[PDB]
Ligand binder design. Sequence first.
Ligand SMILES: Nc1nc(Cl)nc2c1ncn2Cc1cc(OCC(F)F)ccn1
Ligand SMILES: [Mg+2]
Ligand SMILES: [Zn+2]
Length: 338
Amino acid sequence: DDVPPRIARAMENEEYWDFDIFELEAATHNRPLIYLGLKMFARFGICEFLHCSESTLRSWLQIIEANYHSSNPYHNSTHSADVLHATAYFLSKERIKETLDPIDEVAALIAATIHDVDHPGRTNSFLCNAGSELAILYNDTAVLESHHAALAFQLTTGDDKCNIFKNMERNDYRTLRQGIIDMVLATEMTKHFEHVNKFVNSINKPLATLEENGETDKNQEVINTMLRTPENRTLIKRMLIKCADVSNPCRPLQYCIEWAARISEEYFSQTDEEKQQGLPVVMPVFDRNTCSIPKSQISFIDYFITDMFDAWDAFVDLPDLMQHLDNNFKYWKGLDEM
Ligand SMILES: Nc1nc(Cl)nc2c1ncn2Cc1cc(OCC(F)F)ccn1
Ligand SMILES: [Mg+2]
Ligand SMILES: [Zn+2]
């Protein structure tokens, strides 16, 4: 409640897409998730739904954010705060409110908070090839993604003060647990095109068929009934967490460049270690001695981001994000200068 002024000023216009997350990072001293989490959870009313105190929520945000590695350029507390901001923005849209339930809103915001907890600044492929403790523990199968969700519940339910899922019905927690686990696992790279294609085939293509008929009152209930099913709601949640996780190319110009620099620097750390130890180089293009950052972002946007956000835009309607995506794509093209 009694928040200091710079951090209060940093979280002024938080409902808007244009948001200075790096000012909040600098203001909070690499503790943006606890301050942004408290406001976002209070605005939606998470602890009113979950039945918990503010002290229970603060201890949960404290222990979670502590396990985020500050030494990592990209995968740190500030990334999850940005993903939590992206998640809350999509939940606030007219399409998502009428489609999803309050249990899904809570599942999304909690998942966004924990989705990269205890990230070692290294990919799944690095851990499997190196033979890391988690690679052996999870059998080279969603090594990081399973560790993020597992460790999050270990820290939450393990301690009594940190447990936000204390005063809940066994059925409500069981449903909410499965919802969070699914969204955290859906962020995995290998399952990208599977989750994108299912969103197009099961939601967008049927919805395009029904919208061609008209705006009839009976037709809206057919659209509502179809989208609100347990299967399609899960596919929307899978798509929402995936877009929110990689929303940095659809941000304002100065924020887009900063996120690109961090994730690039993180891959160069991995590439130097792989060459030193004598491991198989999984990302040869991302080497500090050879990598064009502008050209790499153009490759990244064309392969993954363009088609994903196109489908997501068709469903939700996101004029700000696609306008930023166009401006940032043209900016990287301008930096060639040859
Ligand atoms: N601007 C970005 N560029 C690159 Cl090269 N990687 C990024 C970026 N922002 C997050 N990451 C991590 C990531 C994300 C990823 O997402 C696949 C799909 F969700 F986009 C696949 C592999 N690494
Ligand atoms: Mg991850
Ligand atoms: Zn992530």
